[PDB]
Amino acid sequence: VSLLDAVDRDSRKAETSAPERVRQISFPMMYFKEVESITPDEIQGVRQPGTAN
Amino acid sequence: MLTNSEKSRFFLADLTGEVQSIPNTYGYISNLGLFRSAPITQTTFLMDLTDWD
Incomplete structure (x- = not known):
C-alpha cells in the first residue's frame, strides 16, 4: 500500500493501486541408512562381562 | 562346569x-592271621626251654 496524493476537485482525476504477486518453490529431503549384523562367533564361548562362568 | x-x-x-x-x-x-598279639608292660621279655630223652 502507499499514501494517496491529493488531487484537484473540478478536474476529475484519480489514482489506482498495483496488483499482487505470486511465486512457487520446492524442497528436497535427506535420507539416512544404517546396517548391522549378528554372527554365531560373537556368542560361542564368550563370558558374560559382569559374572564368572 | x-x-x-x-x-x-x-x-x-x-x-x-x-x-x-x-x-x-x-x-x-x-x-x-598267623600272628597272635601278646602285649607286655616292659622293654624286654624272657623265656624258658626244657627237654629230655
Whole structure:
C-alpha cells in the first residue's frame, strides 16, 4: 500500500493501486541408512562381562 | 562346569572331572592271621626251654 496524493476537485482525476504477486518453490529431503549384523562367533564361548562362568 | 580358557580371561572352557592314582598295597601275609598279639608292660621279655630223652 502507499499514501494517496491529493488531487484537484473540478478536474476529475484519480489514482489506482498495483496488483499482487505470486511465486512457487520446492524442497528436497535427506535420507539416512544404517546396517548391522549378528554372527554365531560373537556368542560361542564368550563370558558374560559382569559374572564368572 | 566351565572355567577360564587356557590363554584368555574372557573365554570359557569345560572341565571334565578328574583322574586319580593310588599306590599299591599288598598286605597278603597280614590277612592270614598267623600272628597272635601278646602285649607286655616292659622293654624286654624272657623265656624258658626244657627237654629230655
